[PDB]
Amino acid sequence: TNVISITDGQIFLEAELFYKGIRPAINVGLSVSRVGSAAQVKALKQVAGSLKLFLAQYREVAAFAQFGSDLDASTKQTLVRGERL
Amino acid sequence: FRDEEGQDVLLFIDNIFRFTQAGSEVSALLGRIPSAVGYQPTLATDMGLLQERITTTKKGSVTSVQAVYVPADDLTDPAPATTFAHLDATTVLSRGISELGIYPAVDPLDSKSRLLDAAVVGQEHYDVASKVQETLQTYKSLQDIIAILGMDELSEQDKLTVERARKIQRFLSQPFAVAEVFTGIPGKLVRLKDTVASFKAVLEGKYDNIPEHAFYMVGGIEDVVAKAEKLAAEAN
């Protein structure tokens, strides 16, 4: 808690994603970068905004990927994009 | 500033969680055998001494806007609950909303206000706020079924409510005059009456045909239609 409260950013490497083979398994759901796109390449910022949006959508829909039931076409597309990313 | 000058002042606590952490810390340096909450025995004493001193005295009023940092929702610890006891109106800034695009990140349904009543803020203001909150509550209530089933099967009344709630949620995001170094969009200093009028007009269905992207990252309803025209030009 102390180190999280001190440092601007907290990169979260949790073993669950590593066991899922993400490697280095950055928990984007919990990882935080206060500096953010300010100190980032402009092209990198452009791609990373959409990347972060798509990973957030995948995270909030990732449960249905585990369920694997008859999902909506848009939700299926978002899940496919998130898993591919 | 409140007493001698006799003017309303704005007290801004950077992080009350860091304040209580530092209090427990300085307790750790000294003897200060922790008994009250577990990490600080004095915490109640100095915590009340601090909070009690912000008071609307006969000379002036001090508004204390404190920021509470919850690490991974550590509500079990008494420290966030102690701050939950002091305040009267909360402005929680859950990260999930900011991840969607509304970077202000304040949760419409979890940011309650003590003075949010028709007697204080106004009948029209309270009605608009309650209706918007109900619409957004229905939004996140039906979001799960929309995700697991789809949009077509949803009822037409619920379809209208979810569309209006999406428009309102985009409307929540507002340019900050302090955020131009990261966003580049000039800030929009809106007014409370203008805010209530715009929200009532949007919820009334007069601007349902306007795309939801128009309400995103704008100020007033005039800014809404301006961004609508801009995005229409960009698209085609």
Added chain:
Amino acid sequence: AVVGQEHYDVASKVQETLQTYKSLQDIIAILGMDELSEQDKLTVERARKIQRFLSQPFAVAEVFTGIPGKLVRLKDTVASFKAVLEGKYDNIPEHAFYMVGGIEDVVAKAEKLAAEAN
């Protein structure tokens, strides 16, 4: 560059299968194993077969497990696990991998259980 690309791929895939099993433990538990997708069910079955295959009799534990403590070479283990991950032994019951060594022990146990059960 140490154990070889094939060994690394095999280890990563078996870890993936076992992690899918652990993640879907509760899903099998109270939601229902049959209430699952075909791919997830196949991965769970492969992970269970792998976990059964991880058992190995020990010579010092011969009196404990009741099976002679045969040894397996690294190349044999890599080849057997690569073949298992390909699904070549899906029809074989999970209990065949119990307390065995190489894939030869697996097929011998499968044949003996088929003969004794008929």
Added chain:
Amino acid sequence: SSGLKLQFALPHETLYSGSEVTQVNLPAKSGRIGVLANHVPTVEQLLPGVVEVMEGSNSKKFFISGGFATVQPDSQLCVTAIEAFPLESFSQENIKNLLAEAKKNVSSSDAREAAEAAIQVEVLENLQSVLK
């Protein structure tokens, strides 16, 4: 019993169930049968065609896509149906004619498909006659 209790049912949306009806003229296997009241019990298939249902309302054309002329001794006629026929919305010619010509063009398949193509052509001609 006075009149008839027509039970017009569909797998998607039933039309009538024990409703008063005067004439239930329906396209029998041989021809079409007129049912007025206490008709003789009978069981017999229906070819596609207009199931003329006279009731308190105005003229109601109800083209059928399959059913039985099943009449009870108690005048409770039950005309089973598969596809409904709106009085005016269903009546269209361009799409029907185009589909008929396309099916006639693709009717030169094998004998198993040829019989189906011929029956489809005959039912398309029936639809064209029903269009009026």
Added chain:
Amino acid sequence: EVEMRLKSINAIEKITKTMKIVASTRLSKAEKAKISAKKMDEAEQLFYKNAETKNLDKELIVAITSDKGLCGSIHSQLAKAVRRHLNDQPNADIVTIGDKIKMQLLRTHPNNIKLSINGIGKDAPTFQESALIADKLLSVMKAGTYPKISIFYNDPVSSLSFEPSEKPIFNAKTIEQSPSFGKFEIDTDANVPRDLFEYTLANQMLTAMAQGYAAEISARRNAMDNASKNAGDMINRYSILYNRTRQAVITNELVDIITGA
């Protein structure tokens, strides 16, 4: 237990709730379809009790189920019903519709089964697919040869309780002659025996499969409600355990502060 609590609250409780909700939304549409088809089913059954066409004195078994993967107890109930029927007579060409019922029939009587159909329980029933299935069954299997045809399909009473209701199928042999075939006028040149035999084989099977889908999704709703109750009480007891453990952290910090300091 933080990961366990998370996977209990947001991975087996809320999404199971919303999947029960979508099951209920499907239940409404399937109930509408079921009553629509039950209209002509009631018509046919009342006609058949009006004109007794019972068959006297080469058997057919039809396993009709949706594609749901054993939603609690409906598939086990259907499997035990077909097992009992096979014990009564194991000399019928079993036709299986679905996946779970298909593998149940495979593991029970692989020799008796000779036809399997997949991709049926995708959504609410459609008439065209059922009629085509009936045509295929009467063509390749020649259901007319068997005097009796058995169709298996569950029936929910109101919401929860289900039974393996079976409806007899009347062949052309028992239509051309019957105890009360003279009541209803027939046309010999029209070949109405075979026509009515095929019509009942189509209508009864179609509505049987629609009712089986309705019962399957009702049992799915019941099973997911049971799973939701299990998730709820597991979450309650594990949240009590979580509070106990997190308070035990406070007790541990209390003891090491009053011992060390």
Added chain:
Amino acid sequence: SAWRKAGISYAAYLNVAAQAIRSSLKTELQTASVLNRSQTDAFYTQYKNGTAASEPTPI
């Protein structure tokens, strides 16, 4: 006409009649139910004593 003799069967007669009725209609009449009726994916397979799956031919 010749469904019993030359055609497939009576069930095929209802199938073709229903398909003609649904497809040969107005554009606005092609609702969701009509879409489900048009879409057929019954992949029947001929099993055997040894569960020899012949082929999942379309219906």
